[PDB]
Design a protein around this ligand. Structure first.
Ligand code: HEM
Ligand code: HEM
Ligand code: HBI
Ligand code: HBI
Ligand code: ARG
Ligand code: ARG
Ligand code: ZN
Lengths: 411, 409
């Protein structure tokens, strides 16, 4: 069955067939849509099928479907599964898998870059210190002195679920958050719980507004260990405004490398629980969400005062005016320091081209409108006017429970 | 069964049971979400259950579920259907149904006012002139000299599909759109077509930027007729800026009464194909969408120019800067002339309050996030952080084919 999506600003209509290759569920039903809900070990029995589907997808991609190599590989994997209850991916398959998990990530607006992902194979890693070393190398490679390069580091896959590798941080680089006894929060409120865990594990917190958190790494199911990322490897950008000189006085800054590190990467049934990946920021992530969310740094009021805006009534749109300025500042500061970053207009325009290309060459592009449309100026970006279909393809990136909720402490 | 929705800014969690009474489909399936797609006569056998469902909910609301009156009514309607192959709602039922259709409109952010809807029963209507009269009265009543009042006028229900009442305009009051020789478009591009169908009908068009279109009314299935709305009944607002004295020079204006007229109202299986309704504007509808959409008035560049902003590269956010000033202008203009209007911050805050009331008093509130979150400053409004469940409840307002693609002169 064919499904069509229309762009209401350009009348361009596209046909989606790729959704037929989707077997996973969305969370919605014929009677209800859960499109705005944030969060809507395997056995041989179930592993064989998943491996085959994947290998079939892989061999078709290299134009070797049905070849001897394809058949030999399928036989080899099946023997290995029956013989060990699992199987190891070849390097080529891992790279293909990682790239496609990105290509299939419906919430990511930066997918036009999917094929250029640098994949670091850390499957030979066995200890927390080893993990730290791999992570430091990823950060330095990806940061590339400001000329950011997309990358992902893949640690050993899950086996019995009791020997998991996990990066307890939600992002490799992030600022600590501290709940004060007067009820206020110093730093980033989003990371208060994790910061408390770090302190308990022994981290000596400098209790500032922008303290880079330490890495809390778990290897082979052991208790996590603390490590400090070499400061020389953490690139930060002081935020200033091109017209307002008092902006710099707000004492704001952010890190240049966004590296999600708490997701699970699934490839051919295999589960990679520690797979930190990084790209580069879209301005609004920082300027709109990290700085202006009421539950994050929440700087709107202060910026509004400095601008001497009429804050007596919302209809003055003081919040909106300030939001724009803060976002102009974030983009300007990053550009001035030559640290890669993309504004939402540029990012969304590129996503539309990528999407159309994907329909034509792949038969579709699963996309989550709720996440794709920028958190500011929605309708003045092309994606707002673009109908999208959301469905789950594999390989894929999945959410997983925070480790502190499930880890069996060994002492 | 029971579903929970969380607000990530307030951590508040609400439980939804109301979705269980859902009947219609959503467009989605367990393998695919069509949440962002704009567009995802009955027989006696089909009607019977629908009527029962409605009366059952109506009587339950007045606290007399399973009463003699309830039973009698169901039996009465039951009989009427068997004979006339349909039935007539009592006035009380018509009012209850219309109010609930609004209550159930998942794409409406202004539902906190749902119970105050004024309903004008125009079922006794029979001609295009009669319809024109009813519409004029609705406009005057709703405009109320700028102190807007919500209202809906309900014309005769569907019978056989060959005797349908329809308002061909998409809104009671909208501006004309003409295709210039310049290749460009004069007026509102969204109505370029409908405009043509009217100009074709003899409408002498002033061919200006903002020309109030004429009503094209269809009664009892006959072909439609034209009518000019008394200019004294159309409240318009000149758009100026609280700081950019030059803004007014732009020469822009918008009407104060937003009145959707191309939808179909379903109550107890009965279909009301002509049911224009009006409320009042949320600022962004005009400032962000009507003025800044690329396929609408598309006025960003021009405004950014006058503001003398660096339009060389997108990263200067000139588009965003201008967008905000404009929207400040709309709210200022309307407020200056005492014409009801609500900003997106106030409107979304009220919707959150409404959702909570609805959850505690009805077990839920169907809502389409894609439409509820305003087209600008999304995450700066509380609804952005609010998980919502979208489902179809009845009575309801449904989309319907433009008549000029079904009629037959
Ligand atoms: C190259 C630059 C990249 C840009 C500009 C980009 C942009 C974005 C943005 C704006 C979001 C939403 C983030 C949020 O709201 O928290 C996102 C989500 C996502 N992206 Fe990307 N991305 C990039 C690279 C990557 C890479 C390297 C991968 C994977 C290898 C990826 C995987 C994902 C996934 C899985 C999500 C959803 C994460 C979640 O659910 O929290 N992205 N991306
Ligand atoms: C009184 C103030 C009202 C406010 C502030 C309000 C606000 C809104 C807004 C902002 C939208 C989206 C419009 C768009 O993007 O095109 C909308 C849609 C809608 N509203 Fe309301 N509304 C009001 C009254 C009404 C009334 C009186 C009814 C019906 C009795 C109603 C039924 C609906 C429906 C069915 C939609 C979706 C229409 C579509 O699909 O195009 N609204 N409303
Ligand atoms: C409840 C709602 O789904 C939630 O607030 C949303 N979060 C996000 C979103 N979009 C992005 N990119 N990131 C989010 O965290 N859209 C909506
Ligand atoms: C494609 C997408 O569904 C479309 O652009 C949208 N239109 C609208 C929307 N929301 C409102 N209120 N009105 C629209 O017309 N959300 C998204
Ligand atoms: N563009 C990216 N790679 N984003 C990753 C998510 C980062 C997160 N949204 C933040 O603001 O820190
Ligand atoms: N608030 C309302 N009643 N809106 C009805 C829809 C009007 C439409 N969005 C417009 O800008 O013309
Ligand atoms: Zn859905």
């Amino acid at each position: 069955r064919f499904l069509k999506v229309k762009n209401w600003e350009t009348d361009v209509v596209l046909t989606d067939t790729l959704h037929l290759k989707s077997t996973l569920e969305t969370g919605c039903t014929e009677h209800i849509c859960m499109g705005s809900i944030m969060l809507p070990v395997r056995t041989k029995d179930q592993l064989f099928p998943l491996a085959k589907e994947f290998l079939d997808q892989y061999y078709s991609s290299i134009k070797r479907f049905g070849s001897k190599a394809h058949m030999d590989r399928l036989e080899e994997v099946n023997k290995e599964i029956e013989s060990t209850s699992t199987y190891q991916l070849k390097d080529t398959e891992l790279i293909y898998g990682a790239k496609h998990a990105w290509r299939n990530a419906s919430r990511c607006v930066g997918r036009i870059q999917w094929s250029k992902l640098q994949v670091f194979d850390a499957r030979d890693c066995t200890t927390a210190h080893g993990m730290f070393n791999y992570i430091c190398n990823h950060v330095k490679y990806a940061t590339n002195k400001g000329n950011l390069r997309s990358a992902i580091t893949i640690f050993p896959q899950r086996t019995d679920g009791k020997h998991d590798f996990r990066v307890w941080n939600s992002q490799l680089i992030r600022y600590a958050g501290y709940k004060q006894p007067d009820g206020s929060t110093l730093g980033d409120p989003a990371n208060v719980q994790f910061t408390e865990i770090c302190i308990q594990q022994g981290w000596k917190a400098p209790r500032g507004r922008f303290d880079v958190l330490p890495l809390l790494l778990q290897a082979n199911g052991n208790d996590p260990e603390l490590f400090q990322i070499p400061p020389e490897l953490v690139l930060e950008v002081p935020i200033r405004h091109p017209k307002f000189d008092w902006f710099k006085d707000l004492g704001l800054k952010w890190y240049g490398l966004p590296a999600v590190s708490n997701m699970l990467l699934e490839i051919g049934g295999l589960e990679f629980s520690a797979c930190p990946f990084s790209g580069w920021y879209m301005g609004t992530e920082i300027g709109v969400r990290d700085y202006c969310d009421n539950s994050r740094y929440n700087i709107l009021e202060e910026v509004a005062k400095k601008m001497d805006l009429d804050m007596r009534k919302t209809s003055s749109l003081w919040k909106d005016q300030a939001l724009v300025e803060i976002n102009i500042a974030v983009l300007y500061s990053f550009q001035s320091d030559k640290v890669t970053i993309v504004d939402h207009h540029s990012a969304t325009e590129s996503f539309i081209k990528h999407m159309e290309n994907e329909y034509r060459c792949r038969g579709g592009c699963p996309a989550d409108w709720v996440w794709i449309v920028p958190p500011m100026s929605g309708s003045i970006t092309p994606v707002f006017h673009q109908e999208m279909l959301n469905y789950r393809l594999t390989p894929s990136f999945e959410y997983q429970p925070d480790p502190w909720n499930t880890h069996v402490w060994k002492g």
